[PDB]
Amino acid sequence: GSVDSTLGLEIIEVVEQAAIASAKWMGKGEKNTADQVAVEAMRERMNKIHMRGRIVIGEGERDDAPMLYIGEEVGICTREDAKSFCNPDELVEIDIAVDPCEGTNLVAYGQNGSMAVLAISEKGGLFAAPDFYMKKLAAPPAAKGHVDIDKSATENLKILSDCLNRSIEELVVVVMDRPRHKELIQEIRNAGARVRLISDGDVSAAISCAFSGTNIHALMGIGAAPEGVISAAAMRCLGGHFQGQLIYDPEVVKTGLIGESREGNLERLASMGIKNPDQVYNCEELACGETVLFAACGITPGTLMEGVRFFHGGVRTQSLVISSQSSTARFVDTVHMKESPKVIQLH
Amino acid sequence: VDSTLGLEIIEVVEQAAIASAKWMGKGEKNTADQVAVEAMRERMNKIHMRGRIVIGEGERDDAPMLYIGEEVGICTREDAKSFCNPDELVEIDIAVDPCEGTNLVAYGQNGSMAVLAISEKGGLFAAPDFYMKKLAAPPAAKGHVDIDKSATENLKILSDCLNRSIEELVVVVMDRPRHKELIQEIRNAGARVRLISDGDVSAAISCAFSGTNIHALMGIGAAPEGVISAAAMRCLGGHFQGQLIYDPEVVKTGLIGESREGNLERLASMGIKNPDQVYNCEELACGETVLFAACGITPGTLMEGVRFFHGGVRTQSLVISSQSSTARFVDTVHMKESPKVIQLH
Amino acid sequence: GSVDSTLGLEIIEVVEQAAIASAKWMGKGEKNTADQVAVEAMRERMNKIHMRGRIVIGEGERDDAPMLYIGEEVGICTREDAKSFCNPDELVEIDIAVDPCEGTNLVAYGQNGSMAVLAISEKGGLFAAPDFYMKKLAAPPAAKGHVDIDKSATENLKILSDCLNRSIEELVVVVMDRPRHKELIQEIRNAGARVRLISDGDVSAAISCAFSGTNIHALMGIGAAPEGVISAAAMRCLGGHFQGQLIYDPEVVKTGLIGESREGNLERLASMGIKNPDQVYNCEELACGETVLFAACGITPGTLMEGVRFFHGGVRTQSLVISSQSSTARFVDTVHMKESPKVIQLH
Amino acid sequence: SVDSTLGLEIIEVVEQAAIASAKWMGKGEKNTADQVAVEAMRERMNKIHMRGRIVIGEGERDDAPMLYIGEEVGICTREDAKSFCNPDELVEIDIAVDPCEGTNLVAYGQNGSMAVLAISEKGGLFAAPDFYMKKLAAPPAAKGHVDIDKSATENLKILSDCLNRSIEELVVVVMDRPRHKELIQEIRNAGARVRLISDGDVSAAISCAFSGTNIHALMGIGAAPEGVISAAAMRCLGGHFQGQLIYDPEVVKTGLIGESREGNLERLASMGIKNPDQVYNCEELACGETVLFAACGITPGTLMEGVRFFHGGVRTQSLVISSQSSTARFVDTVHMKESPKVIQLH
């Protein structure tokens, strides 16, 4: 059959539960704990769905990550003993990209910008990105195809100016606060644009570019490739601009494995069957499937989504779920009622 | 009842609202009603469920769509056993009000929504088309106010329960001659009032959320709408009581030669032993599982109305489930399509 | 001197106090009481301002309306000893148009759309409109000068469609629910636009056109002339489109009394020195002063402003104040603390 | 008596300072972001018919060119003021300013920065020296129940009771500093969630006063002057705020060369501060009969939205609190510049 329509709704609960678990550790100074509980919650809720999924982006390779590892099967319909309870649509093989705790250190420090996020497409519909750095350009729909990752930041800012009908001084660029971005950040400043430096969480920044109202208009710089594919899935559905280019030269940015070599990384990519390492991927190439789903829920507060709030008698979450199938972007504001709360706030 | 049914109903109310909204201010209340009915029905029939309409547009051989007893959903057909699973094959009863406030839509006025409620078979009081005295109030007031108490005593109780003065209370009442004395009493008590021409469902549920500046609904409305309201209120833990009214001296249906003696007959032949019985919302929505869904057609207290813009549509729905024990506001941008601008709000 | 800068800020308190007073009568079924308290409160608060004001649009003529009548002097600096306790800027003569309770029946019924409103300019800076009907066309800044009040509703909708870059079906026109608008409403429906019929209060409707997010894009039809001037004041500061034209034909619309005639009205209009009654004015003409101020506060909830809320330990109001002098549109969300609230809500 | 319109005119003061500073968001110049805010604030203040003295500001006259301690601001400070100012405008008022609260937040384009000031009659505001200050901020419902001398653990228990919610349902803001290692661990051990900030404890303190911020207390050590400014706001809101001067470099160091506990003790005595270990509540930190507070977001924060530059204008959000009118005002201002074709409702 074809990807189950209700999947795009049911993923709301996946990210909600993952975020709620992770949020209990906000500012607790335990980044691995924040990450691990989100992983367990996401995996648990996904395994209760009537789907036949494979993790193509996750916590690591099979013998590195015990849960949500690359190649892991998730969903009721992956089980030999339960497959007969699944209908043809639910049996459709789908690939899944997960990032249960985007910004583990943001959560640990109780800082803004963290979220629980996943993306889905039919089998083979998501670029199974290796854990390499990725040069990224994110921009709003109005600039899609007009800006380009190969152009300089200055040129892109001028193009954004035209496309968004505002001055460069009236633009805001998000860049990760990293030494590798010193020249890039200086260039953006010299061009006249304002900047928001983030310590982590470039998935939220990228997607923020798509929505007029965030006062964020572009993401520039180098982040992680897997996160890039997840961002691209959202942008593909929203019609936003997103390009990525894999970085494999330790001179530009270091992977952190001693001792990394340009040829070393090159061989691995070749080994993974990646023919063109300098290849630039646009949005539709990183998320190329016929059906693309995206789900996110705020853990801590951010530009796109409110953080998880714990109050007397319940919890409140905010999620964004995007579906190419229904062609919708849904903001879900959920009050989770614990036990007969005497007061329920409208907002 | 399937866990995903509580999410699927989002699309049910969204599509009903969108269709009806296209007729905002067009002065056709039946048209606005009919396209909503059809859209809700069509979207329901795409769902893997075996549903039955227990509250709807009318009886079979009268109302063409969403009539009493109508089977809806995929699993109602033969053989569902082959196409849907045991959870999906479960029999559920459905109460619909596809266009609540048909004149509101026709006039482009606030307060209309597409609404429905669900439970297991037997889980919803299949209210007859009679009037119902209603009392809705916030969870803080649940069990403290009472429908049999006067407006004045209820206001005093509300004052204590909500820790605010009567002057700091707002009561919603339907603008009807039958409420002249009630409205006068509320005014004398010192509470502020919002009079509505139609749509007491939104008013009832608004009592449940702090921030609506609405704290109670009082008066007489339709019984079916009462049940749908009670479904939401039970999930939220809000106060809701209803009492059937069958005395034309108090209020008339419009049926020719309608008599109290006559109404009582009808009620009995319908299987209702005590027509003067007060039901709380747990009794009106008594099923193990209760679901409630609403989407704004025009702007209102709980939800924004439907907006059409260049490149799509935007809706706001409220979905409430006792199974997940959640209240979900769903703000959906319907991209149609490839819009160059997407607003955050 | 020039109109005092602080006057643009002081009028916040004027509309807030008028709206708060009026809101106490929400749903009481007394439209005159709701009107009178707003009138008195606005007047009282204006009389504490260091200004030299004259009412040019108000509740009626002296010897008829007791408060805020035509020609009434308001403000501390209208006193005979003014020069001694007022500075030059405070002594400038300003004309004031008031509508203390816009939508008295809305308040009486506890329905949406009522507000306390006023406009200010230097002496002569506001058209002292007579109490006649006025044909009006309101639209957003993007359509300014493109739509025209003399064009048909059908023509204007096509122009609006082009200007706002959306279809006619994606437009919302507000028209007063009146028998005089039967054909107009039908034409708008035929053209494919959606419609909001209002029972009262076309001031809010006109200004809503200027703000994206209101889902209101045009005001068409006939309303009261004085309300039109007040609306024109706001639209002038906002750059919105607003045209007015006096209507004095009893066959088109009647003022209700008595033995009224076009010829009779024509004489009265000549009597006030209104040469050309059929003259079409835009908002720059209706509010032609060098300085224009506009202030409004919601009484009941509406499209621009939230209504007045009374809660335990205070009151909450939302006002909109627009100044040509500071070139600002200010939404003022005020928590009035009746000491001392144990709980203060952020919103 | 203090002029009523002053409580409104300060909207423009913080707006102009915030707008000027916001132009430097993420531009890596904390000193520039700071300088322009200072200048815009002072320039705007000097257009006001007031008789003001700076009691909290950028530094001593020798060290700071603008908004220095003792500087006179406002039209009615001029020699001929009696001639052009009225009696209320002639009332001597003390002013505390922090034109750029979080200069590095702005330079890095991070959340939490504001332009802010506080006003009272002469002697109405504690003229805090630039020393560190132990602070405890909490909501009105907890006022007088929590206490700065109590441990974080007991205060959290008290907060739980007052705010009717579990300790796990509380969020405490703490500055991310080594001096707070133990304090943070204790809060974590008690079961509360934590938001660590790199700067901007004024915003964190005031956020405690408003339900909806999901922030319930501020604990730890910040700058004393900022504390006084925070107290003015909290005093007007009925929120809890206590401060205690810290002068022992063993706890926290000013960084000045050879600063010693006795050194600071000597300095405080010199300044006329009788008891350096005294605990002040916000009524004591802001003791004036009339208190005014004004803040405008520079970058986005929990309390206020940041400055947005768009095609045809700027948008700011400010909070202005007055004990005189007893009002808390949020001001959302679209600065049109000019003839913008599109004006967003929000």
Ligand SMILES: Nc1ncnc2c1ncn2[C@@H]1O[C@H](COP(=O)(O)O)[C@@H](O)[C@H]1O
């Ligand atoms: N034309 C406008 N009029 C008023 N406010 C605006 C306008 N454009 C942007 N804003 C404000 O700036 C925020 C960010 O806008 P944007 O930078 O386009 O994402 C919006 O959410 C509004 O608060």
Ligand SMILES: Nc1ncnc2c1ncn2[C@@H]1O[C@H](COP(=O)(O)O)[C@@H](O)[C@H]1O
């Ligand atoms: N304690 C409070 N402090 C500030 N504003 C409030 C408070 N209570 C209510 N409000 C305002 O009044 C609205 C309606 O409140 P309520 O009548 O409880 O629904 C809220 O959404 C706020 O805008």
Ligand SMILES: Nc1ncnc2c1ncn2[C@@H]1O[C@H](COP(=O)(O)O)[C@@H](O)[C@H]1O
């Ligand atoms: N391009 C868009 N994307 C998403 N929502 C929109 C868009 N345009 C308008 N809306 C929604 O419709 C409302 C009214 O828009 P408008 O008719 O332009 O005033 C907005 O406040 C949004 O909720």
Ligand SMILES: Nc1ncnc2c1ncn2[C@@H]1O[C@H](COP(=O)(O)O)[C@@H](O)[C@H]1O
């Ligand atoms: N009783 C409640 N019902 C629903 N949402 C709530 C409730 N209490 C708090 N929240 C949410 O949590 C946020 C912060 O709450 P608080 O920690 O009291 O500031 C609010 O703005 C709401 O979004």
Ligand SMILES: [Cl-]
């Ligand atoms: Cl499994």
Ligand SMILES: [Cl-]
């Ligand atoms: Cl942060």
Ligand SMILES: [Cl-]
């Ligand atoms: Cl990496």
Ligand SMILES: [Cl-]
């Ligand atoms: Cl698209």
Ligand SMILES: [Cl-]
């Ligand atoms: Cl792209």
Ligand SMILES: [Cl-]
């Ligand atoms: Cl859809």
Ligand SMILES: [Cl-]
């Ligand atoms: Cl419950």
Ligand SMILES: [Cl-]
């Ligand atoms: Cl059937």
Ligand SMILES: [Cl-]
């Ligand atoms: Cl109806």
Ligand SMILES: [Cl-]
């Ligand atoms: Cl009656």
Ligand SMILES: [Cl-]
């Ligand atoms: Cl009926």
Ligand SMILES: [Cl-]
């Ligand atoms: Cl007089």
